[PDB]
Structure formats: structure tokens, C-alpha cells
Design a protein around this ligand. Structure first.
Ligand SMILES: Cc1cc(Oc2ccc(CC(=O)N3CCOC[C@@H]3C(=O)O)cc2)ccc1C#N
Length: 188
């Protein structure tokens, strides 16, 4: 009886039909999202425990960081559109939260150019139909789960992880219990 509704996860009243199998929401302003990236590597360690063909999806949210929240969601869409997530994720986290040198859309663009993306290609992607559509998709997904805070992870649009119901005294025990819950829920 280890896994129970209300302990390591909760159940959505209205499951999201057609949701991605494993969906993470984050913000570059979000302090625990910073640790999920740099210190715990939650996404990498969850991926390791899932079966060969379970796709993970990660979306940025609007509701932290004021005006910059939307600029970052659109920049994350550009990152997804170019496949450069791994080249920009750490510099964006650190520019936002560590050095606090990301204060405008132009500062975000600077991170991409310094990471090797040509400015013209960043701008074309930024203004593209693909990126406009990715932005809407990220917003709909947050609305479909009534998202109120990050970090958050949802499994098959039906179950939401509850990290506060896990053991948080040890980083690596926490990561193990978290990943193991995702695996359990994907098989339900
Ligand atoms: C070892 C370790 C454990 C952790 O355990 C967590 C504790 C809390 C959360 C939730 C959270 O940040 N929020 C804010 C937005 O709304 C939802 C939720 C809330 O507070 O309701 C997530 C994980 C976090 C960091 C480390 C490290 N190093």
C-alpha cells in the first residue's frame, strides 16, 4: 500500500485528453526549478526510469517574472523549435536568477546568440507560425490542468506529482522517490 492518492500524487478531477505522457511545467524565475535543473537533474533522472518509448515534454509558464514571463515562454518555444534547449537552459536560469543580467527580451536574445544561435535565426523563429503555435500550446496545457505553481509534473493528463509528500531530507533519496513515482504512474 505504498502508493496512495494523496501521498505521492493527486488525481485530476477532469483529466486532460490527449495530454503528453509526461509533462513538466517550469519557470526560469522559479527557485525550485533552478535546483531541479542544476542540482537534482530531475528530468534526466526521471527519463532514466521510464520505458524506452515514453516521451517527456517540458513547457514554460507565463505567471512568474512579470513581463519577462511571456518573453521567456516565447523564447522557450524558440528553444523547442530549434532543438537548442540544452544549449540555453543553464545560461537562462543563471542570467535570470544568479547574475540577474536577464531583464529584457533583448537580454534573452543575447543568451541565444552567445550560445551559438544566429540572431537572424532567433528572430525568424521568434516570429514564426511554429513558435506562435508552441506558445498557445504551452498556455493551453497549463490552463487544462489549472496550473497554479511550478515546478509541476503531470502523468498522462490524469495524475499530478506531490513532491511535498515525499522525503526531502536527502537530495538523492528525493530524486529516487520522485522518479519512481513517475514510473509507477505511467504504468497505471
Ligand atoms: C532536496 C530538495 C527537495 C525539494 O522538495 C520540494 C519542495 C517543494 C516543492 C514545491 C514548490 O516549489 N511549490 C511552489 C509553487 O507551487 C507549488 C509548490 C508549493 O509550494 O505548493 C517542490 C519540491 C526541493 C528542492 C530540493 C533540493 N536541492
Amino acid at each position: 500500500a505504498q502508493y496512495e492518492d494523496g501521498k505521492q500524487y493527486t488525481t485530476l478531477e477532469k483529466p486532460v485528453a490527449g495530454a503528453p505522457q509526461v509533462l513538466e511545467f517550469f519557470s526560469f524565475f522559479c527557485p525550485h526549478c533552478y535546483q531541479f535543473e542544476e542540482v537534482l537533474h530531475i528530468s534526466d533522472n526521471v527519463k532514466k526510469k521510464l520505458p524506452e518509448g515514453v516521451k517527456m515534454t517540458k513547457y514554460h509558464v507565463n505567471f512568474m517574472g512579470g513581463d519577462l514571463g511571456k518573453d521567456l515562454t516565447q523564447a522557450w518555444a524558440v528553444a523547442m523549435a530549434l532543438g537548442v534547449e540544452d544549449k540555453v537552459t543553464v545560461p537562462l536560469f543563471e542570467g535570470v536568477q544568479k547574475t540577474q543580467t536577464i531583464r529584457s527580451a533583448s537580454d534573452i536574445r543575447d543568451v541565444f546568440i552567445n550560445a551559438g544561435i544566429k540572431g537572424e535565426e532567433y528572430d525568424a523563429a521568434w516570429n514564426s507560425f511554429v513558435v506562435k503555435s508552441l506558445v498557445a500550446q504551452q498556455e493551453k496545457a497549463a490552463a487544462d490542468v489549472q496550473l497554479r505553481g511550478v515546478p509541476a509534473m503531470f502523468v498522462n493528463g490524469k495524475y499530478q506529482l506531490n513532491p511535498q509528500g515525499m522525503d526531502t531530507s536527502n537530495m538523492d533519496v528525493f530524486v529516487q522517490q520522485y522518479a519512481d513515482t513517475v514510473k509507477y504512474l505511467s504504468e497505471k
